[PDB]
Design a protein around this ligand. Sequence first.
Ligand SMILES: [Cl-]
Ligand SMILES: [Cl-]
Lengths: 149, 149, 8, 8
Amino acid sequence: SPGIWQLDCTHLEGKVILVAVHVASGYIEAEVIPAETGQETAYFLLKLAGRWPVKTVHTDNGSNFTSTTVKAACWWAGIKQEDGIPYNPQSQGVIESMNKELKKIIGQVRDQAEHLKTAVQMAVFIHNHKRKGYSAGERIVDIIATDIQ
Amino acid sequence: SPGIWQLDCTHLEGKVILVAVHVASGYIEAEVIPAETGQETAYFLLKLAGRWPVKTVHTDNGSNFTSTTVKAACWWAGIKQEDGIPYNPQSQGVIESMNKELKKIIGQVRDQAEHLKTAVQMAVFIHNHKRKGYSAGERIVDIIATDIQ
Amino acid sequence: SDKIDNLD
Amino acid sequence: SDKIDNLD
Ligand SMILES: [Cl-]
Ligand SMILES: [Cl-]
């Protein structure tokens, strides 16, 4: 569980926001891309795996699971690529309320930024620092450091 | 010390690789941009600060220290913007040898990637996972976890 | 234009 | 083209 992440893709303003959630902490990374493609998903996962110790990724849909380019990046970076079937039905709800939360935050900052990519990074920053108390960014470091020790 | 980062800007292939180094661990994040502008530097720091608890950034040159856009992102994200004067002369040599190390890694992967941005992220991955014993990615998590506790 | 990413 | 980011 320190190594498990879930991909999630949501849309705003005619663009796609790809999100990786670290399941045990709720910490996220996200980026804006014009469309979801296997190439954009693969590059996002390469970035994420160079920054955190990513052992398994649950893909967001069957096209990213099937994509040979995504499988090639998971091979390169040492990630076990898995499906995203919600065997635990609580997963659907958690992801949906996370996307609603991020979109809420994006609206609260949206007028401080010309580009959506800035607003989405402001929303990542607020989500990860929010104390609910520890923040998600505190929880992910604790979890992984406990694993290393 | 857990919160201190240094910016570094190096060139390859007529493009610019902007790097942030966590000084106490040697962990890095990097991106390829076509040129090093205050707007690009500012976005990069907004991204970094939403992922790690960035307290101070030592800027890589006086243009980025002077840039009002860079100071606006450091204000937004709660970062202390500082100069990067090598008062300890060991800094110049450490940065130079990190740039040489990253360019060496990039050459070793370069033919596995069509685009330079891919090669740079493979180089970030290899750098952060290399055990020298612990890796820089293990060191940064231990340091910040020790600080949180 | 009075934005963080476009101060103008 | 035989690359990670361009398998073709
Ligand atoms: Cl799409
Ligand atoms: Cl430049």
